[PDB]
C-alpha cells in the first residue's frame, strides 16, 4: 500500500537526498519535487531524529538535538517530505 | 506500522547511531534478536543511501561496489 522508499512516520514520507546542497538549493530541490524540508518540531521527539539529524530543516538550520552557527555557507544532506 | 526505520521487502532495519566496534555492534543486534545487514541484500537497493559506511554482517563496512577493519568504530543497523 506504501511506495515510500525511505522514512514513513505519520502519512509523511521522507526521501533522502544524499547530495550535499546549501539550504536554499535543498529547499528549491524539495519544492521542485512538490515537497518540503522536514519540520524540526515534527521529527525532534521521534525515532526519525537518528536519520534527519544534522540535515537541513524547514526552519533554515540543521536539525539538532540541542556554537555560533554560521550556516549560510554550509552544505548538508536533506530529506524531502510530500505527497 | 511498527517499523521504526527502513522497510525493504519484509525486512525492517533500525539505525543505531552509537559508534561501536564490529563485535560490539554484532552483540547489540544479537541482544535485540536481530542481525547486521547483508551487503548483497542492500547493495543493489535504495537502502545503500542509508546503510553505506555502516557495519555489515561480513565484518566490513557496506560500500557501493568496491571489493585494517579491527579497530574501527561505525554505526550499524539491526533487522
Amino acid at each position, epitope marked *: 500500500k506504501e511506495s515510500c522508499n525511505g522514512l514513513y512516520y505519520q502519512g509523511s514520507c521522507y526521501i533522502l537526498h544524499s547530495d550535499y546542497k*546549501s539550504f536554499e538549493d535543498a529547499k528549491a530541490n524539495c519544492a521542485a519535487e512538490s515537497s518540503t524540508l522536514p519540520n524540526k518540531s515534527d521529527v525532534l521527539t521521534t525515532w526519525l531524529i537518528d536519520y534527519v539529524e544534522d540535515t537541513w530543516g524547514s526552519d533554515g538550520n540543521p536539525i539538532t538535538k540541542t556554537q555560533d552557527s554560521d550556516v549560510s555557507q554550509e552544505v548538508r544532506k536533506y530529506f524531502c517530505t510530500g505527497s | 506500522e511498527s517499523c521504526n526505520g527502513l522497510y525493504y521487502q519484509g525486512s525492517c532495519y533500525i539505525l543505531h547511531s552509537d559508534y561501536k566496534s564490529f563485535e560490539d555492534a554484532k552483540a547489540n543486534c544479537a541482544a535485540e534478536s536481530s542481525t547486521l545487514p547483508n551487503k548483497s541484500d542492500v547493495l543493489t537497493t535504495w537502502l545503500i543511501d542509508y546503510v553505506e559506511d555502516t557495519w555489515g554482517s561480513d565484518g566490513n563496512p557496506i560500500t557501493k561496489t568496491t571489493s585494517d577493519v579491527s579497530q574501527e568504530v561505525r554505526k550499524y543497523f539491526c533487522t
Partner: antibody, heavy 125, light 108 residues
Framework: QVQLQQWGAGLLKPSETLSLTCAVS????????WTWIRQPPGKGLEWIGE???????NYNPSLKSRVSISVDTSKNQFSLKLTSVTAADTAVYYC???????????????????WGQGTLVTVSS | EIVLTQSPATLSLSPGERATLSCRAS??????LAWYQQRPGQAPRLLIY???NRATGIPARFSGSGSGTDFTLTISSLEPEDFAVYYC?????????FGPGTKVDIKR
C-alpha cells in the same frame, strides 16, 4: 567560518620524523574528517591521510608504512607523524577539512574545504 | 588505484575567452569528483564538488559537468584572476588522488 592553523619543524635531516599539528576553530571538530595533503615543490598534490574524532584513520597505501595521524579532541587539534623522512618528502604540507559533514551513514564526502595556509618542510642535512 | 589524467597540460587563451578543461579517470568514479584552483604561492581553493555543484561564493562563470570517467570544467569568460593551475580530485575505494593539473596561460 572555519579556520585552520599549522605549525611544525620546517627543517628536518634525513631519517628523522616529521611532526606537524593542525588546530581548528569556528566549526564542529567532531563532525568532519580531517586530512593532510602534501605538495612537493613544483609538482602535483598528494593525499596523505585522514582522521575522525572517533579515532578512525585512513592512510594512503603508498605512505601507510610511515604515516600516523593522531587527534586531540580536547584541543580541537590533530597531528601528523612521518617517520624515516627522505629527500622526496620535501613538500608544502596542508591540513584541510573534508567539507561534507560526516554523518556516519550513507555516501561519504569527497572534497576538501577549507585548506590550511601550509607548512613547508625541507629535508636536508 | 584510480589514476586521474588532465589534458591539455597547458591552455593558452586570451582574457574573455571560454576555457574548457577535461579530466579522465582510469575507472568510474561516479560523481565523486572535485575541482580546485591554485595560484602561485597559495593553498588550493575548492571550485566544484560532486562534479556539478559550485562551492560557496564561487562565481557563476565556473561550471562543472560529467560523471563516471569523463569530467569537464568550464569558465565561460576568463578573468585575469582565473589564470592559474586547476587540479582534479576524486575519492574511490579507500583513498583520494589528484590529477596532474592544467595551467591556464595568457595567449600570445
Amino acid at each position: 567560518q572555519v579556520q585552520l592553523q599549522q605549525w611544525g619543524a620546517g627543517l628536518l635531516k634525513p631519517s628523522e620524523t616529521l611532526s606537524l599539528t593542525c588546530a581548528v576553530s569556528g566549526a564542529s571538530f567532531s563532525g568532519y574528517y580531517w586530512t593532510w595533503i602534501r605538495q612537493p615543490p613544483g609538482k602535483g598534490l598528494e593525499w596523505i591521510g585522514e582522521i575522525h574524532h572517533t579515532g578512525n584513520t585512513n592512510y594512503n597505501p603508498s605512505l601507510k608504512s610511515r604515516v600516523s595521524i593522531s587527534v586531540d579532541t580536547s584541543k580541537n587539534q590533530f597531528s601528523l607523524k612521518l617517520t624515516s623522512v627522505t629527500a622526496a618528502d620535501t613538500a608544502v604540507y596542508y591540513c584541510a577539512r573534508v567539507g561534507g559533514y560526516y554523518y556516519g551513514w550513507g555516501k561519504k564526502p569527497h572534497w576538501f574545504d577549507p585548506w590550511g595556509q601550509g607548512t613547508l618542510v625541507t629535508v636536508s642535512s | 588505484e584510480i589514476v586521474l589524467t588532465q589534458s591539455p597540460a597547458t591552455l593558452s587563451l586570451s582574457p574573455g575567452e571560454r576555457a574548457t578543461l577535461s579530466c579522465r579517470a582510469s575507472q568510474s568514479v561516479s560523481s565523486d569528483l572535485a575541482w580546485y584552483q591554485q595560484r602561485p604561492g597559495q593553498a588550493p581553493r575548492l571550485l566544484i564538488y560532486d562534479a556539478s555543484n559550485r562551492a560557496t561564493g564561487i562565481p557563476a562563470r565556473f561550471s562543472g559537468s560529467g560523471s563516471g570517467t569523463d569530467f569537464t570544467l568550464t569558465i565561460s569568460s576568463l578573468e585575469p584572476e582565473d589564470f592559474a593551475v586547476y587540479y582534479c580530485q576524486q575519492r574511490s575505494n579507500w583513498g583520494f588522488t589528484f590529477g596532474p593539473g592544467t595551467k591556464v596561460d595568457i595567449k600570445r
